[PDB]
Design a protein around this ligand. Sequence first.
Ligand code: CA
Ligand code: CA
Lengths: 132, 132
Amino acid sequence: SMCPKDWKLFGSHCYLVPTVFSSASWNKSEENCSRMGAHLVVIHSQEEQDFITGILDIHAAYFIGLWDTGHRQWQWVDQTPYEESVTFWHNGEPSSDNEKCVTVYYRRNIGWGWNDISCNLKQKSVCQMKKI
Amino acid sequence: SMCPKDWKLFGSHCYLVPTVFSSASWNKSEENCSRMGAHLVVIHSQEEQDFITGILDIHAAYFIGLWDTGHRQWQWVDQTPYEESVTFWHNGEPSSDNEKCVTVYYRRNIGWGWNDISCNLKQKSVCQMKKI
Ligand SMILES: [Ca+2]
Ligand SMILES: [Ca+2]
C-alpha cells in the first residue's frame, strides 16, 4: 500500500529501524537509508518525535538526520528548515562543538531526547521516506 | 470529479487553502498539504501566480513551496527547477539571508508578490496536487 513492507505509517511518511544492519557511523547510516530510497529521520514536530521514539528500543541510541554544518548550525539531511523552538534536546544538550551529529536516546525517569555526539561513533538509526 | 471536494481546478492541478488548522509554520504547512497527498504550491508561470492569488484573501499572507536550502539557493518542495527569470518577488525581496521560507501577500496599490520570512512564523498556506 502507502508504505513498503514492514515500514510504519505516520503522517505523510513511512518509518523503519533497519534491525539487521549492524551499528554504523552517521554517514554509513545515511548511506544505508538511501539504499532503501530513504533518509535518516527529519523530526519537525512533537508528533514525529513521539511516533519515531514509539518504535525504538529504550536500551538503544539512534542517529537522526540532524548535523552541525558549522558551529551549532543544525541542518536536516533533506535540508528542510531547522526550528530551534521545535526541538527535543536532552537537558545539557547540545554539549560540545566537536559533536557534529545527533542521536535520540532514552534517559531513565526523563524520556526520549536528542544528544550531540561524534559522527564516527557507531549507533543504531531510523529511516523515513514519503508514502505513495 | 477532476478535483476533490472544495478544491479548485487550474490546468492540470487542483488548489486548496486549508481551513482545518487556521495558521502554521512552513514545515507544518508542508506536512498538512502532504497528508492530503498534496504539497505547498509550486509556481511555474504568471498564470499559476494569478490563479493561486485569485483564490486568496488580500488581508492574509500564505506560505508557498519555496525555501532557501543554503545561501539564497531557492528550492521547490516538488524538486522542479527554480528559474530566477520566472519569479514574482515583491520589490526589495528576497530581503535577507535570515528569511529562508517564502510567503505570497498583497501590497496595497501594488498587487500580490513573494516575500522571504522566518520559517518559524505561522502563516496560512495553499496546497496543490495533480488532478484526477
Ligand atoms: Ca553531547
Ligand atoms: Ca523578506
